[PDB]
Structures are given as structure tokens and as C-alpha cells.
A paper describes a structure:
In addition, when [name] was over-expressed in E. coli C43(DE3)-ΔacrB, the MIC experiments confirmed its role in the extrusion of other common antibiotics with high efflux liability like linezolid and novobiocin. This suggests that [name] can form a functional complex with the E. coli AcrA-TolC and further confirm its role in conferring antibiotic resistance against a wide spectrum of antibiotics. Based on the available experimental data and conservation in the transmembrane proton transport region, [name] can be classified as an active transport member in RND class of efflux pumps.
[name] from [name] was purified and its crystal structure was solved at 1.85 Å resolution. The asymmetric unit contains six [name] monomers/protomers and each monomer is composed of 1040 residues. This analysis demonstrated that all the protomers within the two [name] trimer molecules are highly similar and are in binding/tight conformation. The [name] protomer substrate-binding pocket is located deep inside the periplasmic cleft, between the β-sheets of PN2 and PC1 sub-domains. The head group (maltoside) of the first molecule (DDM1) occupies the hydrophilic pocket close to the exit funnel, whereas the second molecule (DDM2) head group resides near the entrance formed by PC1 and PC2 sub-domains. The hydroxyl groups of the DDM1 terminal sugar ring form hydrogen bond interactions with two positively charged arginine residues, R48 and R157, while the second sugar ring interacts with the three glutamine residue sidechains, i.e., Q46, Q134, and Q178. The charged arginine residue, R157 present on the alpha helix of the PN2 sub-domain, is unique to [name] and forms hydrogen bond interaction with the DDM1 molecule.
Numbering used by the authors:
A (entry chain C): 250 to 348
B (entry chain B): 101 to 298
C (entry chain C): 597 to 943
D (entry chain C): 448 to 497
E (entry chain C): 51 to 199
F (entry chain B): 746 to 794
The structure:
């Protein structure tokens, strides 16, 4: 706001805040995110080819749980979708079918 | 491995780019692995002379090259003859200078008046109350035809009249290159080399 | 506002844990479009709820159908992210003859209706929408230049005030961020707001934009889509295998498109459909090779060129029994069934 | 075991996305068939006599 | 290309990029989607079995060759070329139950404190963040007050 | 200035790449240069202004 745009007639300095509102805001307004109608941000975690999906989901959850100890109160995290359940189910099915 | 050689060269070229003359950088440098194995040569030609090499080369670029490049087993398609279309402004330096103009004036005016424009929107954030509509705006900055390029305004003369580019230049959709010609049994042509991949 | 109503609906439907909502997100492209929104409904584990996913979906649909403010939908998810469906199809309509955005919209409407009335095929879906109201600012270039306003200044005024300008970067919280300049929102709401922007002529005078342009309403696509180098529109759609196979579906759509599309438009298959249209059926080699290899092993075991037939000729009967059970129960011949058949033939 | 490999292993060479699915089944089933045959010629009769 | 009409993005950004990319080995098809948020996404898809690291580098070579064709404001923001990791493993959200923090705050919290920690985990191919935007210093001008001076 | 002097030789006699334009669905260069009959003799060079 204290940026100088010019010298006015009376010798005063015209500042940016004299012609503008200045705020630390957003680079983009195009997409919004809610979780159960609360403001949110979503994070998609994709594995690489050759990874172990079950180990990766556990490691992401464990890391989130460590990070979450430093969250400001009133900010929480959730994992609303975990597709590793499908191969976890298939493994459980192999073991149960064998038995 | 030709793909490893390609990438190592292309990344060194990328590092040389800061050393190159500005005009070379604005045109762009290409790095391309060569496919050594020719499969077929194909030509377009005009039996009765209705079309010249410039027309046929750009027909190939527009209508043939990309459809060939999708065929299974192609490694490279090379086009030989004439050049890409280019909008050519052929200045008469005596007329330019007689209007008090330099070549640099002319180039600057052409860059001013044939340009990409960002026109914005109405109704976008931030608003104290909720907008009902988002309306994109259109404004044409780029020119398309010889006539439009000829109507570029180089300056205002002392009597206030507009000096046009067509008043000091001949303007034509012409060739980007006159270096290479192509004939087929002495008729105008363009040559196409199809190279297979390994 | 409509997404938040749909989220409330899903949240109050028995069996739904989450409404993961993204107003702005066009689910067909995963890019942002202001009149589109996506909301995923996360379901409880089956054993924590009474209804199936289809029942829950049917319930949500009956409720979102009562929202008048836009066209809401809820659908079952694909079995595989990044391939989509399995019997359905995916294509683009390409405009190769410079016919323009309005003719592409008419082609989309005409193909989509014709497809909707094919038995076993519902109305396909598209990202394309050429009728988005817009504004066209026609610059009187001679009149700007005659009075000393350069087009760089004129265009630049529109760009920064109405579109925003990237200025440069600054650092905060240990990271790099953009600095952006734009008119505040209340000054870029109306056509008069455009006309009242002021640029400066070579005399130093402030000149209103409105004195050098004509503003009029128009229409245009948002987003603009290109496919293989041409303006294009996507069509995603279903084809009921109990009515028509995916191959008959593709053949029909090729023929529709030949009758409906104007000269200079065409269709191209994409995603799974492109693969079907470009893959050969190597089963025509693989199946005889498998039978000949098994015959040869048995001819060795039996030292007979004829006895192997006592084994090979019975395996169609196992295939028949299995498919009969599938048929009697209303099933289809999916890949799990197909491998079941081969394992049974092995047994 | 060879007859079953004659049937299953060619099924690992079918085209397209479905071919990639068939390959997962075919190779896995062919392996188990071969290992079960090995076991059937070694451990299973040995255990039975014992 | 902030503020640019989707038609201008398609004509002056997507078109030269596609012209450069056209011909890259093993490409099956390519699509461009230009929106009124000013963002172009061009997706280049390659034949099954293509090495995705090889696809990535060939596309990034063609992008480099087109970059000189692009509008100055596009070049100033910078273009990115990124191979896609198609297999989703987990969706994680941050959210504020009472409303003390909004999506802008939380997205930038994820960018500052979460994303790089997740991206270091073994087996991660890609991390995608959905919602609000990175912080920016926004100067909201009042054109009448600017022109009054 | 040498910039003006060298720039005059370069545009008139060597051509200058101006920028691009769109036609037929594609991008093409815009080029400026003296027409051929004004760059044939050493006098043509000397007479550039
Ligand atoms: C309760 C929380 C649930 C969160 C769930 C997270 C997963 C959501 C997946 C929804 C989409 C599934 O459907 C999927 O859509 C995308 C986007 O069109 C398609 O993707 C297609 O278009 C995208 C977008 O341009 C391109 O990257 C690509 O060329 C193509 O594969 C997939 O082929 C299809 O399988
Ligand atoms: C403005 C600039 C213009 C933009 C340029 C447009 C890009 C053109 C699209 C490239 C099309 C590639 O063309 C396509 O190549 C693919 C991938 O190899 C081939 O695809 C097929 O090849 C063989 C056929 O059995 C299979 O092994 C493969 O799995 C299958 O995908 C097709 O034969 C061809 O249809
Ligand atoms: C021991 C494991 C053995 C598993 C082998 C069992 C099946 C063997 C091959 C299946 C026989 C036909 O082989 C294959 O059939 C499938 C489905 O019927 C066809 O699949 C076609 O239809 C399906 C759905 O209708 C489309 O999703 C698919 O993209 C398309 O190609 C293939 O074009 C053909 O190649
Ligand atoms: C909760 C959803 C979980 C992920 C599901 C994704 C599957 C869809 C397949 C299509 C591919 C997605 O493609 C992905 O698109 C998104 C746009 O939405 C891009 O991401 C972009 O989205 C938004 C748009 O404002 C920003 O918050 C973000 O920082 C930006 O990078 C990714 O860089 C790209 O990788």
C-alpha cells in the first residue's frame, strides 16, 4: 500500500493504497472445496507403478497423524475415500477361501 | 540409446539458449533424433501447373503429414521443398523513409496491432454480494488477412490522416523460405520422406 | 448453492458418510468451469448400512430431481479410474472444416438426440456448451489511433482492470507467491464498467474505453476443447449389452455420424473405444494354438493321433453347462466368468 | 500339467485391456498348476505311504 | 493466461503447443481444454506399454520448442509438463468444523506443511491438491480513483 | 545509434521475424523485409534511411 505512484499537484505522494484495496488473498477463485458442507481442501495421493498400495495408505495415515498433532485447534483431517480396501478385501478372501 | 542421446543433447541446448542471439531464441531451436531408415518417398505434384510448391507443401503440412505420422511403424516424416506459409510484408524502404519512418517503427507497429489480447470477465470475485453471472469478454487483437495487415496504422501524418502499412509495402501470404525448390519431372512438387522406426 | 443442497441431501441419506464437494469442478475433464460442480458421496461400509449403493443412488436422485435451479445427477462410479465403464463408449466430434462453434453445438445436439433414441443407449454427456453468454468488445482501431491512444494502452487497460495482470513475485511464510493487480470486483460488473475504464492518450488526457469501442452480447464455448489438433466436443455414453454389444454400438455411431454430421466434421474414438477400434482379436490365433498344443501333449501321452479327441471333444459341454447357469440367473459373460469357464474346462 | 499349461499360458497373450486382465489369471493359474503337480509327484505320495 | 477468453487460449496457447507436440513417438491422441479461469490443460496420451518417463521427456522437449511461440504473460507465469500417476491410493481432506479457518487458509496450510511431507513417502507417485488457490498479494484497483489521478 | 543502424540493415536486407498469426487452424510467422528490387545493389544498401 505504501508503493509510490506519483507526486500530486500539492506535492503529496500518491500511494497505491490511495487507489486500491490490498490484501493477501487467493491466486485462484475458480474451484471451491467442502467436506459435509464445511470449508475444506482435498488431497489426492497417487501411488507409483510398483508400489504397495496398502503400505502407502498406512504410511500416509501415519504421517497425517503425526502432522495433525501440530494442527491449530479447529482444523481437522479426514480420509473420506480409501480404495485400498478393495485389494485388502481380496487378500482377506484368499485367506478365507484357502481355509 | 538414441533416446538417451536425444535427451542429453536437448538438455545441453536448453542450457546454451541464454548465450544465443535474441532473434534466434525468438524463432526457437529444435533438437531431434534422426531416424535413419527410409521406407517410402511420396510426392505431391501439379500436372497442369494450377498449384505451385508453396501451395502443395502447406497442403501436405495441413492435410497429409499428420495422417501419415499416425500410421503404425512411422519414426519420422520429412517434408522437402518450398517453406511454411508466412505473412510477408515487403517494404519499399524509400516510401517508409519518405513518411519519416524507420524499419524499427514498422516492426513495432506490427507487433502492437497483431497481438494476443486478454479481455477479462464481468461478475468475477471478489464481490460484497453473490454474483449471479460470470460473463467472459472477447476483444480481437490478432489479424488474419492480407487486407487487415495492410490496414495496420504506422503513424498519423501532420494533416491527421492515418499512414497505412499498405501505403509503404506489398503484403502477401507467401513463403517462410525460398532456399529449397522441389520438382518432379520438371513439374512443381513437394517431397515427403517416410522413415520407419526400429 | 446447488452443490451445497446436494451435499445436504446426501448427508441426510441413510448409508452416506461424506459429501466431498467441489463447486467449479467439471467431472468430465477435471478442469474448472463456473456453471459446473461435482460432489462425491462416500458410502459407509456395507455392513454399517441397510441399503445398497444402487438404492442410495436412486434415493439421492429422486431428491436432487426436485432442485429446479440446475440439472443435478448422481451415478454409480466406474470399476476403474482412468478407463471409464466397459460397455459404453467415448468419442470426440471434430470440426475439421472451420465450421465454427455454433455448428459444432448443432452437431452435438443432433448426434445426442439420435443416440438417445437408439434402443439401449441413453442421451450421452458432453463438456461442450457453445451457448455461454459473453460480451464482444469491438475496438474502433482507427478512432483510437486517430486520437493518440495506442492499442497497447487500450488492450492493456482491459487486460489489467478486467482480466488481472501478473505483476511479479514476493516471499512470505518462506515461500514464493504471485503479486496480482485487477479492478476490485464491484468495478467490473456491468457493460458500463467496461466503457468507463480510462486509458491515456499521447497528450496525457484520460480517455474512456467506451468512446473507442462497441460492446455487444455474444455467445461462446466454455471450456473450449480441442482433440488431435481440431476444435472438438466430447460425447460419453452408455450402451446396454443386453440390447447391443459395444462393437455394434460403435458401428451404429459411426453410421449415425456419417448421416448426421456435415461435411467437414467427423468422429474419433478415444479412451477404451479407441483401443477396441484399433486392437485386433488375437483369440483367432490364441485359441487354435491352445487346442493344438493340448492335442499334441495328449497325442504323446496316448501314443495316438485319435484318442486325444475323447478328451478335447467333451470340453464344450462344460462351457455350455456353466453359461446355462449364468443365463438362467440373468448374468453376463464378464471376464470373471470367462476365466471361470476356462478353469472348468481344464478340470 | 502340460495340457493345462497348453491351455492357460497362451491366454496370457491376448490383446487389449481385457488381455491384460486375462494375463493376471492365466499366469497365476498356470504357476499353481505346475507347483501342485510337483507336489503331487513328491510330497503327496510320500505322505500317503508314510 | 489470466483473463484471456477460452477462444484466445485455444488459438494462441493450445494451438502452438499442439503443433509442437504433434509427432511425439507412441502418442495415441491429445486433447486441450481451455477455460474461463484462464487455465489450459493439454493431455497427451501414449500407447499402452510406453515408458511414461520417456513420454514425459519427449513432451517436455516439444513444450520447450513451443515456448517462444507463447504469449508473453503465459511465458511469465511459466508452463509445466507432468506425467500422470493414474492409480489413486488415498483421499485426505483438511477441514474446519466451527468455521474458524476457510479453504484459502487450509489449502495453503497443506501446501506449506503437508504436501512435501507426503510427497517424500516411498511409493508416492503424485500428490494433487483440490480447492481454493495458493496465496497471492492482491491489489484490487478502483479504476475511477486511478484515473482521477 | 548503432542499434538503429544495424537494425535498419537487418530488417530491410536480412528480414525480421515480427510475430505470429493464425490461419487454416495453424500458427505461421509474420516477416518484414524490403521487397527484392530494393536490395539488389550496393547503392540500395547506401540509400537505406
Ligand atoms: C467419497 C470421496 C470419493 C472421492 C473419489 C475420487 C475418485 C473419483 C473418480 C471420479 C471419476 C471416475 O471417472 C473417470 O473420469 C475421468 C475424468 O473424466 C476419466 O479420465 C479421462 O479424462 C481425464 C480428464 O481430462 C483425462 O485426464 C484423460 O484423458 C481420461 O482418462 C477417467 O477415464 C474415468 O475413469
Ligand atoms: C494443431 C496440431 C495437430 C495435432 C496433431 C494430432 C495428433 C494426431 C494423433 C496421433 C494418432 C496416433 O495414431 C494412432 O497411433 C496409435 C498408437 O500407436 C495406434 O494404436 C494402436 O496401435 C496398435 C494396433 O494394433 C496396437 O498395438 C496399439 O495398442 C493401439 O493403440 C493406431 O494405429 C493409430 O490410430
Ligand atoms: C486361465 C485364464 C484364461 C482367461 C481367458 C478367458 C477368456 C479368453 C479370451 C476371451 C475371448 C474373447 O476375447 C476377448 O473377448 C472380449 C470380451 O468378450 C472382447 O472384449 C470386447 O468387449 C468388451 C466388453 O464387451 C470391451 O470392454 C472390450 O474392450 C472389447 O475388446 C475382446 O475383443 C476379445 O479379445
Ligand atoms: C478428490 C479427487 C481425487 C483425485 C481424483 C483425480 C482423478 C481424475 C483423473 C483426471 C486427472 C486429474 O488431473 C489433475 O487435474 C487437476 C485439476 O483438477 C490439477 O490440479 C489443479 O487443480 C486445482 C484447480 O484449481 C488446484 O487446486 C491445483 O493446485 C491444480 O494443480 C492436477 O495437477 C492434475 O493432475
Amino acid at each position: 500500500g505504501n508503493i509510490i505512484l506519483k507526486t500530486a499537484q500539492d506535492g503529496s505522494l500518491v500511494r497505491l493504497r490511495d487507489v486500491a484495496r490490498i490484501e493477501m488473498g487467493s491466486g485462484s477463485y475458480a474451484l471451491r472445496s467442502q467436506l459435509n458442507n464445511k470449508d475444506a481442501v482435498g488431497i489426492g495421493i497417487f501411488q507409483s507403478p510398483g508400489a504397495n498400495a496398502i503400505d502407502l495408505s498406512n504410511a500416509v495415515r501415519a504421517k497425517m497423524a503425526e502432522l495433525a498433532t501440530r494442527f491449530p485447534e479447529d482444523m481437522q483431517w479426514a480420509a473420506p475415500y480409501d480404495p485400498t480396501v478393495f485389494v485388502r478385501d481380496s487378500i482377506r478372501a484368499v485367506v478365507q477361501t484357502l481355509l | 540409446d538414441p533416446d538417451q542421446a536425444q535427451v542429453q543433447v536437448q538438455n545441453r541446448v536448453a542450457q546454451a539458449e541464454a548465450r544465443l542471439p535474441e532473434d534466434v531464441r525468438r524463432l526457437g531451436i529444435t533438437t531431434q533424433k534422426q531416424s535413419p531408415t527410409l521406407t517410402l518417398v511420396v510426392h505431391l505434384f501439379s500436372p497442369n501447373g494450377k498449384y505451385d510448391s508453396l501451395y502443395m507443401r502447406n497442403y501436405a503440412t495441413l492435410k497429409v503429414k499428420d495422417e501419415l505420422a499416425r500410421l503404425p511403424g512411422v519414426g519420422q516424416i520429412q517434408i522437402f521443398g518450398s517453406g511454411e506459409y508466412a505473412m510477408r510484408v515487403w517494404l519499399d524502404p524509400n516510401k517508409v523513409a519518405a513518411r519519416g519512418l524507420t524499419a524499427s517503427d514498422v516492426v513495432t507497429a506490427m507487433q502492437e496491432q497483431n497481438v494476443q489480447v486478454s479481455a477479462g470477465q464481468l461478475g468475477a470475485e471478489p464481490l460484497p454480494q453473490e454474483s449471479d453471472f460470470l460473463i467472459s469478454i472477447n476483444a480481437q487483437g490478432r489479424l488474419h488477412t492480407e487486407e487487415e495487415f495492410g490496414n495496420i496504422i504506422l503513424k498519423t501524418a501532420q494533416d491527421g490522416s492515418l499512414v497505412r502499412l499498405r501505403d509503404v509495402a506489398r503484403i502477401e501470404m507467401g513463403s517462410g523460405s525460398y532456399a529449397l525448390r522441389s520438382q518432379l519431372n520438371n513439374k512443381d512438387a513437394v517431397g515427403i520422406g517416410i522413415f520407419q522406426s526400429p | 448453492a446447488v452443490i451445497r443442497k446436494m451435499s445436504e441431501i446426501g448427508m441426510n441419506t441413510e448409508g452416506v458418510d461424506y459429501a466431498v464437494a467441489f463447486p467449479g469442478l467439471n467431472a468430465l475433464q477435471f478442469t474448472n468451469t463456473p456453471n459446473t460442480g461435482t460432489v462425491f458421496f462416500g458410502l459407509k461400509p456395507f455392513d454399517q448400512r441397510k441399503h445398497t449403493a444402487a438404492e442410495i443412488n436412486a434415493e439421492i436422485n429422486a431428491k436432487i430431481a426436485q432442485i429446479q435451479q440446475g440439472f443435478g445427477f448422481s451415478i454409480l462410479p466406474p470399476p476403474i479410474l482412468g478407463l471409464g465403464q466397459g460397455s459404453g463408449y467415448s468419442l470426440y466430434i471434430q470440426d475439421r472444416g472451420g465450421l465454427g462453434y455454433g455448428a459444432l453445438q448443432s452437431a452435438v445436439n443432433a448426434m445426442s438426440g439420435a443416440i438417445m433414441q437408439t434402443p439401449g443407449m441413453h442421451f450421452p454427456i458432453s463438456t461442450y456448451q457453445a451457448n455461454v453468454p459473453q460480451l464482444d468488445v469491438q475496438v474502433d482501431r482507427d478512432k483510437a489511433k486517430a486520437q493518440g491512444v495506442s492499442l497497447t494502452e487500450l488492450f492493456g487497460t482491459l487486460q489489467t482492470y478486467l482480466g488481472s495482470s501478473y505483476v511479479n513475485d514476493f516471499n512470505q511464510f518462506g515461500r514464493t507467491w504471485r503479486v496480482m493487480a485487477q479492478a476490485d470486483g464491484p468495478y467490473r460488473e456491468s457493460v458500463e464498467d467496461i466503457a468507463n475504464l480510462r486509458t491515456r492518450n499521447n497528450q496525457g488526457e484520460m480517455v474512456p474505453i467506451g468512446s473507442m469501442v462497441n460492446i455487444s452480447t455474444t455467445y461462446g464455448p466454455d471450456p473450449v476443447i480441442r482433440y488431435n489438433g481440431y476444435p472438438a466436443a466430447d460425447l460419453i455414453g452408455d450402451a446396454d449389452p443386453r440390447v447391443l454389444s459395444s462393437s455394434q454400438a460403435m458401428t451404429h455411431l459411426e453410421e449415425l455420424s456419417k448421416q448426421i454430421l456435415p461435411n467437414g466434421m467427423n468422429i474419433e474414438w478415444t479412451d477404451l473405444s479407441f483401443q477396441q477400434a484399433t486392437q485386433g482379436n488375437t483369440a483367432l490365433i490364441v485359441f487354435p494354438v491352445a487346442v493344438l498344443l493340448a492335442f499334441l501333449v495328449l497325442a504323446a501321452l496316448y501314443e495316438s493321433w485319435t484318442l486325444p479327441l475323447a478328451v478335447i471333444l467333451i470340453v464344450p459341454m462344460t462351457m455350455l453347462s456353466a453359461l446355462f447357469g449364468v443365463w438362467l440367473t440373468g448374468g453376463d459373460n464378464n471376464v470373471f466368468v470367462q476365466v471361470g469357464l476356462v478353469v472348468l474346462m481344464g478340470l | 500339467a502340460l495340457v493345462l499349461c497348453a491351455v492357460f499360458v497362451p491366454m496370457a497373450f491376448l490383446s487389449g485391456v481385457t488381455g491384460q486382465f486375462y494375463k493376471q489369471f492365466a499366469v497365476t493359474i498356470a504357476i499353481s498348476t505346475v507347483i501342485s503337480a510337483i507336489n503331487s509327484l513328491t510330497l503327496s505320495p510320500a505322505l500317503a505311504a508314510l | 493466461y489470466p483473463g484471456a477468453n477460452p477462444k484466445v487460449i485455444a488459438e494462441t496457447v493450445a494451438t502452438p503447443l499442439e503443433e509442437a507436440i504433434n509427432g511425439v513417438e507412441n502418442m495415441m491422441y491429445m486433447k486441450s481444454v481451455a477455460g474461463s479461469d484462464g487455465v489450459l490443460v493439454t493431455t497427451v496420451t501414449f500407447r499402452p506399454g510406453t515408458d511414461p518417463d520417456q513420454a514425459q521427456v519427449q513432451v517436455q522437449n516439444r513444450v520447450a520448442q513451443a515456448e517462444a511461440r507463447l504469449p508473453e504473460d503465459v511465458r511469465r507465469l511459466g508452463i509445466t509438463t507432468q506425467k500422470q500417476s493414474p492409480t489413486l491410493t488415498l483421499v485426505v481432506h483438511l477441514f474446519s468444523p466451527n468455521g474458524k479457518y476457510d479453504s484459502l487458509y487450509m489449502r495453503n496450510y497443506a501446501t506449506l506443511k503437508v504436501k512435501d511431507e507426503l510427497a517424500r513417502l516411498p511409493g508416492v507417485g503424485q500428490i494433487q491438491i483440490f480447492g481454493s488457490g495458493e496465496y497471492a498479494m492482491r491489489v484490487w484497483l478502483d479504476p475511477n480513483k486511478v484515473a482521477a489521478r
